[PDB]
Design a protein around this ligand. Structure first.
Ligand code: CLA
Ligand code: CLA
Ligand code: CLA
Ligand code: CLA
Ligand code: CLA
Ligand code: CLA
Ligand code: CLA
Ligand SMILES: CCCCCCCCCCCCCCCC(=O)OC[C@H](COP(=O)(O)OC[C@@H](O)CO)OC(=O)CCCCCCCCCCCCCCC
Ligand SMILES: CC1=C(/C=C/C(C)=C/C=C/C(C)=C/C=C/C=C(C)/C=C/C=C(C)/C=C/C2=C(C)CCCC2(C)C)C(C)(C)CCC1
Ligand SMILES: CC1=C(/C=C/C(C)=C/C=C/C(C)=C/C=C/C=C(C)/C=C/C=C(C)/C=C/C2=C(C)CCCC2(C)C)C(C)(C)CCC1
Ligand SMILES: CC1=C(C/C=C(\C)CCC[C@H](C)CCC[C@H](C)CCCC(C)C)C(=O)c2ccccc2C1=O
Ligand code: SF4
Ligand code: SF4
Lengths: 132, 33, 137, 80, 741, 158, 74
C-alpha cells in the first residue's frame, strides 16, 4: 500500500521480527526518488507518505539520517511488538534530540569531573561498579 | 585384569562423554534454576 | 518477464520468491514430505523419517568401514548404523526436552516425543531392512 | 545494557548526540555551561556500545563516557 | 565527428614551490605535521587522487601522466637489464655452449668477502647466476652479439626519457579534457587494432625476417661469428631462400591468395623443437600473424566516428532476461565514470592472465634452451603466479573501493549490481557452504591418510594401492588432447604440449618435457587448490558486497573504504571494513599460492625434471616419490620441505650462501610481522608515552609528537611484513634448491 | 485453445483434423500435457542417441559404443526397471503438482504464481520449447526408423 | 655459544618483564585512558577514538607477554 516501491531483497527482517520487536519508519516525500535501502540496493519512495519496516532501530535511524541529509525529509520511527503494541521512539517529543527542548530531564548525569570516580576497592562485593 | 580395559575404555570415551554432554546440554538451556 | 518477486508480496522480508523457493514443483514436493505433509500423526512423521534414514545409513558403514573387506562387513555396518541411530535419538530427545519446555503439530513436548519414538522405530526398521536386502544380493 | 554517563565538564556542543546512531543521547536545558545545554542518556537500552559519542567529544577527557555491561538483543546489534 | 581531440594548454604551471610543501595535495595534510601520524598519511594518500579532487577531469589527467611515469620506469628497468647483459654478462659464452654455461649477468664488488657470491658459472666468467630467462629470450631474438644488446639498452633509455617527457607534457603543457578520456569505443579500437594488432604483426615480421633464419642457423651448429648480421637477411633474398625456399616466390603468393606456399616458415607442427627444446619459431610466427589478423579485425568492432560499428551502451542495455530485471543497464556509465571499476576489472583480468601465462609457459617452453634450465622455469612460474595472485586481490580491493565511493543507487535501480546486492546474503551463505564442504572433504582426505599411515592401516588410506580417487575427467581430457593431432586437429602434426602424452623430449641428456600422469595425489591437491581459491573468493566477494552496509552497520558506506572498526559495540566490530576483507584475502591468497607453488615444484621435480640415458631410461630428481608421499601432511613435511631444504641450510661457504642468508632473513621478517599482527595500538601508545617521558626528562622532545601506528597501519605493516617474509623464504628455498644443479 | 503457447509458426494454428475444435478444457489440457511430455522425452532421446552414436559411452558400458539400438540390449532388466522407477517417481511428483488449484498444462514451475505479470516473451519462449520439442519428436522417431530399416546406423551414411 | 644464548635469555626475560610490569603499572590508567581502573582488568578496548585503543587493558598486557614467555622458554 504505502510501502516504497521495492523489488525485495534477502536482507529484510527475519523470524525475530515476528517473535520480537519489529520497527517501522514513516516519512513524507515531496517527490518520487530513489534512495538506498539499509539492507538491499535501492528503492523508490512514493510521493506523499511512505511506510517501511526493519528489524533494528539502527537501520531505521541510518535511513532517517540518509533522508534528512540528502532529501531533507522529516521522519518518525515506531516499534511494534508481536502483541500489537506500538511505541513511538525517535522523535520523543516532536523535536529532534540535537535541539534543546524545555521539559526534558537529565539522565545519567554526574556532578563532578570524570576523574573523581571512586576507586574499585571502595565499591567491592556490592553489585556495583565505580560509575554506578 | 586384561579384561577391564575393553569394558572401560568404551565407557570412558563414548558412554561417559555422551551422557555427560547430554546432561550438560539439558542443564545449560534448562531456562529454570 | 520477472520471475523474481518479493516473498509473500512483502518487499521488506528477508526472502525472495525465486523458482527454487516458491514454485509448484518445490511447494508440492516439500508439502508431501513426512515432515510437512498434512493429516499425519507426529508418530507417523517420525516413522517415515526413520524408515528413510535407517535404510539410507547401513551402506556407508558396510562398504567403507574397517571391516568392509571381511566376510562380516554387512553386520558391522548394520551395528554401526544402529549405534548412530541411537545417538541421533538421544539427540532428538534432549532437543525436545530443551526446546519445547514451557497429538498436535510436531512442535510440542508430546508431539516431539511421539516423533522421536517413531523415528527410532523407523530407523531400526530401515537398518534391519537394508541388512535383510544386502544379506542376499 | 550499557551505561552512558555525562559529567559536568560537558560544554553542550551536541556533537555526541549527533554522532549517536541509536538515538540514545539527547540535549536537556542546563545552567552550568555557557550554551545552557547538557547531554543526557535517558534511553540506554538502545545503546550498542559503538562509543561514537566519545569519539565525537571536544572536552579534554570525554565528558560523555560509555561503560559496557550486560548484553541484550538490542545492545548486541543483532537483527535476529 | 563525435570523437574528437580536446586538450587544455598549459594546464598546470611547472615549479618547485610545491616540492617544498609536502602534503599539498590533500587538504588535511597541507597544514603541517602535528604528530608523526601525518608522515605516514603523506605516503598513504599520495596516489589517492580521487580523494584529493572532486573533479573527474583532474583525476583522469593525473592517472594518465602517472601511467606515463610508470612506463618510463619500466623502460629504465629494461635498459638496465639489457645493459647488464651487454657489459656484465657471459651471454656470448652461453650462446656458444648453452647447455653447460650457466646464465649470469650480475657481478658483485669484492668488499667484505661477498665475492664468494660470484659463482663459477662458466665461460671464463664469474657472477651471480640469473634466473630471469633473459638469455633465452635474447637468443630467440637472434641477438648473437653484445653490440645489439648495448643498442637495445640505449634505445630503452631514450624511450624512458620520452615517456618521462610525455608525462610532463601531458600534465603541465597539453592535458586532455575529460571528454577525451571518455571514449571507450575509440580507445578499444586503437588498443586492439594497433597496440595489439600491429604489435603482433610487427613481431611476426621480425620473426620471419630476423629470428627465424638466425635461430635456424644456430640450430644447424653455425657459430655466432659466422652468422651474417640480421640486416643481411633483408637485402639479398636468396640468402634466406637457402633456409626457407619459399621467399624465392616473394610476396606474390600472399596477394594471390596462395598462402599455402608459405608453409615452409609458417607451420602448424606444434610440439617442441627436439634440438633446442623450445617451441618451433615458425609456429610462433604463424601464431603471431594469425593473432595480428584477429586483433586488427576486432579493432573495427566499435563505432567511433563513422556510423558503422558497435555502441557498447546499446549492447549492454539490450542484454536483459526475466531473471535479471533491467539487465546490463547502467554498467557503461559505471565503467566510463569511475576509474576504480575499470581498475578492478583490469587487475582481475591481468592477474588471471599472468597465472595462465605461468601455466602455459612451463608446459610448452617457448624459448630455446629454457626447458632444461630448471632454475629459470621454476623462477618464471612462481614469479608470474605471485604477480597474478597480487593482481587478483588488487582487483577485488578496487572493486570494493568503487562500491564504497563511486556506487550511486539512483543510476543502479534494479540492474545487475542492484540485484547482486539484494541477494548477497544467499550468495555468501552458499559460498560459505561450498568452502566448508571443500575444506572438510579435501583436507580431511589428507588427515585421514596421515592417521591411517600412523596407525599402520595403509590399506585404508586414499592412495593408489588403497581406496583410489582417480581424476578420471582430467585423464579423459589428457587422452583427448593426445588423440587430437590428425583427428580433431588434422593439420597439426603433434600435440600442443607433451604434458598430455607422447615422447620424452630431452635436450643434452636433460628431460626438457615429458607427459605428466595424474594420480590420486593429483586429485587431492587439485581439490585443495579449489578449496583455497573458493575461500579466497569468499573473503574478497564478502568484502565487496558488504562494503556499503550490513546487518551490523547499516551505514558502513559513510565510514569510508578503510576504517579500523565501529567501536566495541554490538559485541565487537573489529575489521568490519572492506579494506580489512582485502587484508584477510591477501593472507588467504598467499596461502593458496604457496600450495600451488609447492605442488608445481614437487610434481615437476618428481615426475618431469630429471635425466635420461642413451638407452632412454628416465631418472627423476626425487625418484617419483610424489605418488605415495604427497597424500599425507607428514609426507609433505618430510619429503618436500625437510628433504629439499638441504640446499639452503647447507649453502654456507658456497656461491649460494646468499640464498641461505635470505632464507634466514625472510624467516626473521615473517616472525617480525606477527608483532604487528597480534598486538594492538593501545599497548604501543602507552609504551611510547613512557619513552616520551624519558626523552622529555633530558629536554629532548620532538616537536612532531610520536604516535603509535594507526590500527589500519598496524594491520597493513603486519600484512606487508608477513607477505615479504613468506615470499622471500620460498624464493630462497626454490632458488637454492634449483640452482644446486 | 488458440491463445495457449505453441501457436507461433509458419502454419499458425495447425489442427487439420478436429481434435481441439470442440474439446473441453480438460481434454485440451491433456493434449498439451502429452505434447510436452513427448517433446521433452524426444529431445532427451535425440541427445542420447547423438551421444551414443559419437562413441561417448559410460565407463560401465565399455563394449557397446556403436549403435544405440544395439546398446539397448546391453542394459540388464533391472537397469530398465530403475529407469522406470525414476520416471514413475517424477510422474508422482507431477501428479501431486496437478492437484494444486492453479495448474497450467506443462507449467510444473508454477509460472502463473511466479511471474510478476503474464508476458508475450514468456509465451514466445514456451513456443520455442514446443517447436524444438516437436522437431525432436519427429527426429527421434525418424532416427529409430532409419536405424531399424537400414542397420548401418547414423554417422554411417544413413 | 653459551655466552650468546645467555644474553638472548636475558633479552627474553627483560622483555617479558617489561611487558608484564608495564601492564601492571598502567593497569590503573594511562594518558590514553586516565580512568582505566573504572573499566576493570579485562575489557576489549575503548573504541577507535583518539587514535585507537586496541589491546589497552592489563589483560591484554598479559596476553601479549604470554607470547614472549613462550618464546624465551623455548
Ligand atoms: C587421574 C588419574 C588417572 C588417570 C589419568 C588414568 C588414566 C587411565 N586409566 Mg586409570 N585408574 C586410576 C587413575 C587414573 N587413570 C585409579 C586411581 C584407578 C583405580 C580405580 C584406575 C583404574 C583403572 C582401570 C581398572 C583401568 C584404567 C584405565 C585407564 C585408561 C583409560 C581411561 C579409563 O577407562 O578410565 C577408567 C577409570 C576408572 C573407571 C576409574 C576412574 C579413574 C580416576 C580415579 C578418575 C580421576 C578423575 C580426575 C580426578 C579428573 C576428574 C575430572 C574429569 C571428569 C574431567 C587411562 C590411560 C583402563 C586402561 O588401562 O585401559 C588401557 C582400565 O581398564 N584405570
Ligand atoms: C634500472 C635497473 C638497474 C639496476 C637494478 C642496477 C643495479 C646495479 N648496477 Mg646497473 N645500470 C643501469 C640500471 C640498473 N643497474 C642502467 C640503466 C645503466 C646504464 C647507465 C647501468 C650501468 C651500470 C654500470 C656501468 C655499472 C652498473 C653497476 C650496477 C651495480 C652497482 C650499482 C651501485 O650501487 O653503484 C653505486 C651507486 C650508487 C652509490 C648510487 C648513487 C647514490 C645517489 C647519489 C643517491 C641519491 C638519492 C637522492 C638523495 C634521492 C632524491 C633525488 C635527488 C636527486 C633530488 C648494481 C647491481 C656496476 C656494477 O655492477 O659493478 C660491477 C657498474 O659498474 N650499472
Ligand atoms: C611489419 C612487418 C613487416 C615488415 C616491415 C616487412 C618488410 C619487408 N618484407 Mg616481409 N613479411 C611480413 C611482415 C613484414 N615484412 C609477414 C607477416 C610476412 C608473411 C606473409 C612476410 C613475408 C615476406 C616475404 C615472403 C618477403 C618479404 C619481403 C619484405 C621486404 C620487401 C617488402 C616488399 O616488397 O613489399 C612491398 C611493400 C608493400 C606491399 C607495403 C621488406 C623489408 C621480401 C624480402 O625479403 O625481400 C627483401 C620477401 O621476399 N616479406
Ligand atoms: C592458427 C595458427 C596458430 C598457430 C600455428 C599457433 C601456434 C601456437 N600457439 Mg597460438 N593461437 C592462435 C593461432 C595459432 N597459434 C589463435 C588464433 C589464438 C587465439 C585463441 C591462439 C592462442 C594461443 C594461446 C592462448 C596460447 C597459444 C600457444 C601456442 C603454441 C603452443 C604449441 C602448439 O602446438 O600450438 C597449437 C595451438 C593451438 C591448438 C591453438 C589453436 C587456436 C585456434 C586456431 C583458435 C581459433 C579461434 C577462431 C579463429 C575464433 C574466431 C571467432 C571470430 C570469427 C569471432 C604454438 C606456438 C601457447 C603458447 O605459445 O604458450 C607458450 C598458448 O598459451 N596460442
Ligand atoms: C594497477 C595497479 C594499481 C593501482 C594504480 C593502484 C592504485 C591505488 N590503490 Mg590499489 N592495489 C593494487 C594495485 C593498484 N593500486 C593491488 C595489486 C593491491 C593488492 C595488494 C591493491 C590494494 C589496495 C588497497 C588495500 C588499497 C589500495 C589503495 C590505492 C590508492 C592509493 C595507493 C597509494 O597511496 O599508494 C601508496 C603506496 C605505498 C604506501 C607504498 C607501499 C608499497 C608496499 C606496501 C611495499 C612494497 C615492498 C616492495 C615491493 C619490496 C620491499 C623489499 C624490502 C626488502 C625493502 C590508489 C588509487 C588504497 C586506497 O584507499 O585507495 C582508494 C587502499 O586502501 N589498493
Ligand atoms: C591451519 C590452521 C587453520 C585451519 C584448520 C583453518 C580452518 C578454517 N578457516 Mg581459517 N585461518 C587461519 C588458519 C586456519 N584456518 C589463519 C592463520 C588465518 C589468518 C589469515 C585464517 C583466516 C581465515 C578466514 C578469514 C577465513 C578462514 C576460514 C576457514 C574455514 C575454511 C572452511 C573449511 O575448511 O572448513 C572445514 C574445516 C576444516 C578443514 C578444519 C579441519 C577439520 C578436520 C578436517 C576434521 C577435524 C576432526 C573432527 C572435527 C573430529 C570431531 C570430534 C572431535 C571434536 C573430538 C575453516 C574453519 C573461512 C571460513 O570460515 O569460511 C568458510 C574464512 O572466511 N580462516
Ligand atoms: C530418452 C532418454 C534416454 C533414454 C531412454 C536413454 C537410455 C539409455 N542410455 Mg542414454 N542419454 C540420454 C538420454 C537417454 N538415454 C541423454 C540426454 C544423454 C546425455 C547426457 C545420454 C547419455 C548416455 C551415455 C553417455 C550412455 C547412455 C546409455 C544409455 C543406456 C543405459 C542407461 C544409461 O547409462 O543412461 C545414462 C544416462 C546419463 C549418463 C544421463 C541421463 C541424464 C538424464 C536424461 C537427465 C540406455 C539404452 C549408456 C549405454 O548403454 O551406452 C550407449 C551410455 O554409455 N546414454
Ligand atoms: C560459468 C558458470 C557456469 C555455472 C553457471 C550455473 C548456471 C547459471 C545460470 O544459468 O544463470 C542464468 C540466470 C538467468 O539470467 P537471465 O538469462 O535472465 O539474464 C540475462 C543476462 O544477460 C543478464 O542480464 O541468471 C541467474 O539466475 C543468476 C543467479 C544464479 C543462481 C544459480 C547459481 C548456481 C551457481 C553454482 C553452479 C556451479 C556449477 C559449476 C561451475 C563450474
Ligand atoms: C533419484 C535420485 C535422486 C535422489 C535420490 C534419493 C534421495 C534417494 C533416497 C532413497 C531412500 C531414502 C530410500 C529409502 C528407502 C527406505 C526403505 C525401503 C525403508 C523400509 C523400511 C522397512 C521395510 C521397515 C520395516 C520394519 C519396521 C518399520 C520396524 C521393524 C520391523 C520391520 C522390519 C517390519 C536425485 C533426484 C537427487 C538425483 C538423481 C538420483
Ligand atoms: C625492444 C625494444 C626496443 C626496440 C624495439 C624496436 C626496434 C621495435 C621495432 C618495431 C618495428 C620496426 C615495427 C614495425 C611495424 C610495421 C608495421 C606494423 C607495418 C604495418 C603495415 C601495414 C599494416 C600495411 C598495410 C598496407 C600495405 C601493405 C600497403 C598497401 C595497403 C595497406 C594499407 C593495407 C628498444 C631498444 C627501443 C627499447 C626496449 C624495447
Ligand atoms: C610495533 C608496533 C607499533 C610501534 C611501531 C612504530 C612506532 C614504528 C616505528 C618506525 C620507526 C621509527 C622507523 C624506522 C624503522 C626502520 C629502522 C626502517 C624504516 C622502515 C620503513 C618505515 C621504511 C605500533 O604502533 C602498532 C600499532 C598497531 C598495531 C601494532 C603495532 C606494533 O606492532
Ligand atoms: S560531545 Fe561531549 S561536549 Fe559535546 S555535547 Fe556531547 S558530551 Fe557535551
Ligand atoms: S579492539 Fe580496536 S578494532 Fe576492535 S573495536 Fe576496539 S578499537 Fe575497534
Amino acid at each position: 500500500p504505502y510501502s516504497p516501491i521495492f523489488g525485495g531483497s534477502t536482507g529484510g527482517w527475519l523470524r525475530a521480527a515476528e517473535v520480537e520487536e519489529k520497527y517501522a519508519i514513516t516519512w513524507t516525500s515531496p517527490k518520487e526518488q530513489i534512495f538506498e535501502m539499509p539492507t538491499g540496493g535501492a528503492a523508490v519512495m512514493l510521493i506523499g507518505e511512505n511506510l517501511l519496516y526493519l528489524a533494528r532501530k539502527e537501520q531505521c535511524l541510518a535511513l532517517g539520517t540518509q533522508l534528512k541529509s540528502f532529501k531533507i525529509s522529516d521522519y518518525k520511527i515506531y516499534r511494534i511488538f508481536p502483541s500489537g503494541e506500538v511505541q513511538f521512539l525517535h522523535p520523543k517529543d516532536g523535536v529532534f534530540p540535537e535541539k534543546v527542548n524545555p521539559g526534558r530531564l537529565p539522565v545519567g548525569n554526574r556532578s563532578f569531573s570524570i576523574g573523581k570516580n571512586p576507586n574499585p576497592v571502595s565499591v567491592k562485593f556490592s553489585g556495583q561498579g565505580t560509575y554506578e | 585384569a586384561s579384561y577391564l580395559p575393553s569394558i572401560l575404555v568404551p565407557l570412558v570415551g563414548i558412554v561417559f562423554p555422551g551422557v555427560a554432554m547430554a546432561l550438560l546440554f539439558l542443564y545449560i538451556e534448562k531456562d529454570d534454576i | 518477464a520477472n520471475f523474481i518477486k518479493p516473498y509473500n508480496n512483502d518487499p521488506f522480508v528477508g526472502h525472495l520468491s525465486t523458482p527454487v523457493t516458491t514454485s509448484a514443483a518445490t511447494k508440492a514436493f516439500l508439502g508431501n514430505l513426512p515432515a510437512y505433509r498434512a493429516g499425519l500423526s507426529p508418530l507417523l512423521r517420525g516413522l517415515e523419517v526413520g524408515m528413510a534414514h535407517g535404510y539410507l545409513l547401513v551402506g556407508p558403514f558396510d562398504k567403507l568401514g574397517p571391516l568392509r573387506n571381511s566376510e562380516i562387513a554387512l553386520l558391522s555396518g548394520f551395528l554401526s548404523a544402529v549405534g548412530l541411530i541411537t545417538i541421533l535419538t538421544l539427540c532428538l530427545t534432549i532437543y525436545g526436552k530443551v526446546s519445547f519446555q514451557e497429538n498436535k503439530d510436531l512442535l510440542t513436548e508430546d508431539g516431539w516425543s511421539q516423533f522421536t519414538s517413531g523415528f527410532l522405530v523407523g530407523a531400526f526398521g530401515g537398518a534391519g531392512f537394508a541388512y535383510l536386502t544386502l544379506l542376499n544380493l | 545494557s550499557h551505561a552512558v554517563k555525562i559529567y559536568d565538564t560537558c560544554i553542550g556542543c551536541t556533537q555526541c548526540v549527533r554522532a549517536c546512531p541509536t538515538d540514545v543521547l539527547e540535549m536537556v536545558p542546563w545552567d552550568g555551561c555557557k550554551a545552557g545545554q547538557i547531554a543526557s542518556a535517558p534511553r540506554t537500552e538502545d545503546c550498542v556500545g559503538c562509543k561514537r559519542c566519545e569519539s565525537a567529544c571536544p572536552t579534554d577527557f570525554l565528558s560523555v563516557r560509555v561503560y559496557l555491561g550486560g548484553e541484550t538483543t538490542r545492545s548486541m546489534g543483532l537483527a535476529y | 565527428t563525435k570523437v574528437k581531440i580536446l586538450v587544455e594548454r598549459d594546464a598546470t604551471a611547472t615549479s618547485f614551490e610545491k616540492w617544498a610543501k609536502p602534503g599539498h595535495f590533500s587538504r588535511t595534510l597541507a597544514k603541517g605535521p602535528k604528530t608523526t601520524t601525518w608522515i605516514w598519511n603523506l605516503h598513504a594518500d599520495a596516489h589517492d587522487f580521487d580523494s584529493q579532487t572532486n573533479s573527474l577531469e583532474d583525476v583522469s589527467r593525473k592517472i594518465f601522466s602517472a601511467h606515463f611515469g610508470q612506463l618510463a620506469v619500466i623502460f629504465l628497468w629494461l635498459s638496465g637489464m639489457h645493459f647488464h647483459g651487454a657489459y656484465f654478462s657471459n651471454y656470448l659464452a652461453w650462446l656458444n655452449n648453452p647447455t653447460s654455461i650457466k646464465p649470469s649477468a650480475q657481478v658483485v664488488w669484492p668488499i667484505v668477502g661477498q665475492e664468494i657470491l660470484n659463482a663459477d658459472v662458466g665461460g671464463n666468467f664469474q657472477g651471480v647466476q640469473i634466473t630471469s630467462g633473459f638469455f633465452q629470450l635474447w637468443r630467440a631474438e637472434g641477438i648473437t652479439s653484445e653490440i645489439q644488446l648495448y643498442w637495445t639498452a640505449i634505445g630503452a633509455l631514450v624511450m624512458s626519457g620520452l615517456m618521462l617527457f610525455a608525462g610532463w607534457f601531458h600534465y603541465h603543457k597539453a592535458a586532455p579534457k575529460l571528454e577525451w578520456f571518455q571514449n571507450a569505443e575509440s580507445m578499444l579500437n586503437h588498443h586492439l587494432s594497433i597496440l595489439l594488432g600491429l604489435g603482433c604483426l610487427s613481431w611476426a615480421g621480425h620473426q620471419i625476417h630476423v629470428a627465424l633464419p638466425i635461430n635456424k642457423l644456430l640450430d644447424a651448429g653455425v657459430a655466432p661469428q659466422e652468422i651474417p648480421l640480421p640486416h643481411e637477411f633483408l637485402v639479398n633474398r636468396d640468402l634466406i631462400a637457402q633456409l626457407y625456399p619459399s621467399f624465392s616466390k616473394g610476396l606474390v603468393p600472399f596477394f594471390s591468395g596462395n598462402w599455402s606456399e608459405y608453409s615452409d616458415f609458417l607451420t602448424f607442427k606444434g610440439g617442441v623443437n627436439p634440438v633446442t627444446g623450445g617451441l618451433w619459431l615458425t609456429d610462433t610466427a604463424h601464431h603471431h600473424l594469425a593473432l595480428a589478423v584477429l586483433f586488427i579485425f576486432a579493432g573495427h568492432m566499435y563505432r567511433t566516428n563513422w556510423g558503422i560499428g558497435h555502441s557498447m551502451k546499446e549492447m549492454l542495455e539490450a542484454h536483459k532476461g526475466p531473471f535479471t530485471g533491467e539487465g546490463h543497464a547502467g554498467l557503461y556509465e559505471i565503467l566510463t565514470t569511475s576509474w576504480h571499476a575499470q581498475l578492478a576489472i583490469n587487475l582481475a583480468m591481468i592477474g588471471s592472465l599472468s597465472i595462465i601465462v605461468a601455466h602455459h609457459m612451463y608446459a610448452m617452453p617457448p624459448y630455446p634452451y629454457i626447458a632444461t634450465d630448471y632454475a629459470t622455469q621454476l623462477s618464471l612460474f612462481t614469479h608470474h603466479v605471485w604477480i597474478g595472485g597480487f593482481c587478483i586481490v588488487g582487483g577485488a580491493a578496487h572493486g570494493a573501493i568503487f562500491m564504497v565511493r563511486d556506487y550511486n543507487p539512483a543510476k543502479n535501480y534494479n540492474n545487475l549490481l542492484d540485484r547482486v546486492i539484494r541477494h548477497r546474503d544467499s550468495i555468501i551463505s552458499h559460498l560459505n557452504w561450498v568452502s566448508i564442504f571443500l575444506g572438510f572433504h579435501s583436507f580431511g582426505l589428507y588427515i585421514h591418510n596421515d592417521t591411517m599411515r600412523a596407525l599402520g592401516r595403509s590399506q585404508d588410506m586414499f592412495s593408489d594401492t588403497a581406496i583410489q580417487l582417480q581424476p578420471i575427467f582430467a585423464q579423459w581430457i589428457q587422452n583427448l588432447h593426445l588423440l587430437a593431432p590428425g583427428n580433431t586437429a588434422p593439420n597439426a602434426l603433434t600435440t600442443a604440449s607433451y604434458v598430455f602424452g607422447g615422447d620424452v623430449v630431452s635436450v643434452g641428456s636433460k628431460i626438457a618435457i615429458m607427459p605428466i600422469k595424474l594420480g590420486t595425489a593429483d586429485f587431492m591437491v587439485h581439490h585443495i587448490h579449489a578449496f583455497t581459491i573458493h575461500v579466497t573468493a569468499l573473503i574478497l566477494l564478502k568484502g565487496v558486497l558488504y562494503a556499503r552496509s550490513s546487518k551490523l552497520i547499516p551505514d558502513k558506506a559513510n565510514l569510508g573504504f578503510r576504517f579500523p572498526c565501529d567501536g566495541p559495540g554490538r559485541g565487537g566490530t573489529c575489521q568490519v571494513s572492506a579494506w580489512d576483507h582485502v587484508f584477510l584475502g591477501l593472507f588467504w591468497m598467499y596461502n593458496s599460492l604457496s600450495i600451488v607453488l609447492f605442488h608445481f615444484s614437487w610434481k615437476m621435480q618428481s615426475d618431469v625434471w630429471g635425466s635420461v640415458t642413451p638407452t632412454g631410461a628416465v631418472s627423476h630428481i626425487t625418484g617419483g616419490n610424489f605418488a605415495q608421499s604427497a597424500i599425507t601432511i607428514n609426507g609433505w613435511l618430510r619429503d618436500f620441505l625437510w628433504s629439499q631444504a638441504s640446499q639452503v641450510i647447507q649453502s654456507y661457504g658456497s656461491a649460494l650462501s646468499a640464498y641461505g642468508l635470505i632464507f634466514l632473513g625472510a624467516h626473521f621478517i615473517w616472525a617480525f610481522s606477527l608483532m604487528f599482527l597480534f598486538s594492538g595500538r593501545g599497548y604501543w601508545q602507552e609504551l611510547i608515552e613512557s619513552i616520551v617521558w624519558a626523552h622529555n626528562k633530558i629536554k629532548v622532545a620532538p616537536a612532531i609528537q610520536p604516535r603509535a601506528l594507526s590500527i589500519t597501519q598496524g594491520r597493513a605493516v603486519g600484512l606487508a611484513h608477513y607477505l615479504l617474509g613468506g615470499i622471500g623464504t620460498t624464493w630462497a628455498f626454490f632458488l637454492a634448491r634449483i640452482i644446486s644443479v | 485453445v488458440k491463445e495457449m503457447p505453441g501457436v507461433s509458426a509458419p502454419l499458425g494454428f495447425f489442427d487439420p483434423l478436429g481434435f481441439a475444435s470442440k474439446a473441453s478444457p480438460e481434454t485440451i489440457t491433456k493434449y498439451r500435457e502429452s505434447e510436452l511430455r513427448h517433446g521433452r522425452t524426444a529431445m532427451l532421446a535425440v541427445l542420447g542417441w547423438a551421444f551414443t552414436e559419437a562413441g561417448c559411452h559410460l565407463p560401465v558400458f565399455p563394449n557397446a559404443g556403436t549403435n544405440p539400438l544395439a546398446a539397448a540390449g546391453q542394459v540388464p532388466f533391472w537397469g530398465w526397471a530403475q529407469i522406470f522407477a525414476f520416471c514413475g517417481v517424477i510422474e508422482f511428483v507431477q501428479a501431486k503438482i496437478r492437484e494444486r488449484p492453479g495448474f497450467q498444462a506443462g507449467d510444473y514451475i508454477g509460472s502463473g504464481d511466479l511471474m510478476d505479470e503474464g508476458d508475450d516473451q514468456w509465451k514466445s519462449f514456451q513456443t520455442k520449447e514446443l517447436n524444438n520439442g516437436r522437431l525432436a519428436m519427429l527426429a527421434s522417431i525418424g532416427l529409430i526408423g532409419q536405424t531399424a530399416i537400414f542397420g548401418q546406423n547414423i554417422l554411417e551414411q544413413s | 655459544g653459551d655466552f650468546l644464548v645467555h644474553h638472548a635469555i636475558a633479552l627474553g626475560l627483560h622483555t617479558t618483564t617489561l611487558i608484564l610490569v608495564k601492564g601492571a603499572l598502567d593497569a590503573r590508567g594511562s594518558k590514553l585512558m586516565p580512568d582505566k581502573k573504572d573499566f576493570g582488568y579485562s575489557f576489549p578496548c575503548d573504541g577507535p577514538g583518539r587514535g585507537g585503543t586496541c589491546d589497552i587493558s592489563a589483560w591484554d598486557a598479559f596476553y601479549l607477554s604470554m607470547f614472549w614467555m613462550l618464546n624465551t622458554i623455548g
